[PDB]
Amino acid sequence: MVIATDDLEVACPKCECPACSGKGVILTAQGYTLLDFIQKHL
């Protein structure tokens, strides 16, 4: 709703890979926020 897939990821501007480390794909700040939260409490 207020959060979209776009708010979580972004296609690595290089590999349309060292830049994304094979993730193909870079996490946004909002991405980490959720992931760090979940990993610390799961």
């Binding site: 207020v2 979209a4 897939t5 776009d6 708010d7």
Partner: protein, 63 residues
Amino acid sequence: SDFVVIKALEDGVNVIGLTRGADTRFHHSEKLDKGEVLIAQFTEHTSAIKVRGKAYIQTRHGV
């Protein structure tokens, strides 16, 4: 080939695109501040449009 016309009637109107396929996620959300128009096609990757907030909508059907 179909499309939806969305005219934002207020600020912060959201058009959220849902993914075509077995599983369904919000793949992209576009923002519309009062008076802005988005013309959007249902596509290979998008099979459901969700409209959040007061807005004027035109479809292949009616108004």
